[PDB]
Amino acid sequence: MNFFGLVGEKLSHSVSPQIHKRVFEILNIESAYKNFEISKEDISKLDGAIKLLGIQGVNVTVPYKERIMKYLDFISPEAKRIGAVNTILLRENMLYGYNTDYFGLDSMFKMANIDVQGKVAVILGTGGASKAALTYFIDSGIEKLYVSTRKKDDKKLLNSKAILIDYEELKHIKGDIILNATPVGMYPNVGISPVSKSIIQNFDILIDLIYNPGETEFLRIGNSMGKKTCDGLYMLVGQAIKSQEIWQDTKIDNSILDVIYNELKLEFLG
Amino acid sequence: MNFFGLVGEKLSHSVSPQIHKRVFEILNIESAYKNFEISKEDISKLDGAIKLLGIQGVNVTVPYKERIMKYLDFISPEAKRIGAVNTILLRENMLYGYNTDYFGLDSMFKMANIDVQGKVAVILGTGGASKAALTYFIDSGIEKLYVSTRKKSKAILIDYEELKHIKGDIILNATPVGMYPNVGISPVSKSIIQNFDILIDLIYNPGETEFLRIGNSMGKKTCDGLYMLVGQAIKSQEIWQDTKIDNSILDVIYNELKLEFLG
Fold this sequence. Notes:
Strand content of chain A: 15-25%
Order of helices and strands of chain A: EHEHEEHEEHEHEEEHEHEHH
Distance between the termini of chain A: 34 Å
CATH architecture of the largest domain in chain A: 3-Layer(aba) Sandwich
CATH superfamily of the largest domain in chain A: Leucine Dehydrogenase, chain A, domain 1
Radius of gyration of chain A: 18 Å
Largest sheet of chain A: 6 strands, mixed
Strand order of the largest sheet of chain A: 2-1-3-5-6-4
Oligomer: homodimer
């Protein structure tokens, strides 16, 4: 038996433990995954506890994807590049950090048949997810990329090609894709969108990294205008599988993602 | 089209190119693999050249498995533990180091039905392979493990003189003695070989090594390095292609080569 889990501040909504349970079941693996809610004042204690108790791996979510890096022994090059970690592996009392965010986005975009080549996109928010999305969009030949934040202050982006804007300036931007990388639209207030209907009207494709069985207001507003929408579930399943590949150091059959995603997509709702 | 290859000092005896070619054929992949012979004074230039030319992956063999680690951007947990790299991946201008020796050994021992739990074993040599074998023996519950070197975890270090008095179950050759340079020479004498029940040689040259020839002349169980060499190749391809490869391909390729170099 090996133990794994998800580290974040508030996790009562998370579907990750269910996804990982399903992956272990399909692969006939003796392992278990639970939530590890940890307060901001306690995050410096995580690395010692993982090591002490032999927790083989953890995922990391908001708001710790950047702050956890200083506690790791080795950081994989893709995570260094992106500037955040969402997957940690314990081996020989050392912690290795990885980031499956770029991978999951690539996966989600291919599945949804969305080519970002020569397009205009806006990313909402500035966390680790936003950094991965920025990295993915730039590598994929995005023509114009904006990242929207509530207050610019002295924020700096990873690539000078990306344009930092606030939500006021966003009112006058028209583009192809708008991607939500903010924590807005999950478990508590599912009826609130990070952007108004007027801004949503200026885009053709909405991508929401959030997943909630009840559907986010962001995508609910997009669907009402006949816009192309995509939720975060496929990415969540792909990232779980990639994490599992890293933790076991073995590759998982390609067909498993679709099997798990389709079976889960029903369990929450028809 | 993507390019791959094998980095080592002397590679005339390599069958790795044939193995990889066959993997690409079976999987319908547009890629190619060749030998990259590199001198000791030039090995510091490899990382730059791989990056510059976009070489997606290389294997590394003797005598560079340890020395190359210092030039890479990331060392995987198993490469760090074993202490050697035999597989390098290029991704976004960064080099990642992996070790498939351990995996290949584990695969080989299971195929040959050699169980090491509670047994006595001697490893000849102190390189990266010795390290992979040492790691594998220890993890697999070996009772007593010796590592022999002419110039001298819980492994007991011994010289070839002390080896003369050691009786054991398994003797494994992790030295480069037996390949191309001098293919008619064994790292240990017939007198030492008689003291073990099973010989494992990591070296593979279509023509049986002198080490195993001597073992077979005495009715000892012998196992050459071919299965491990095929297994490592497929594990390297999984890493490079970032995709699962059906295990049936290992038996296909091994049996083609075994049947090729036997009859």
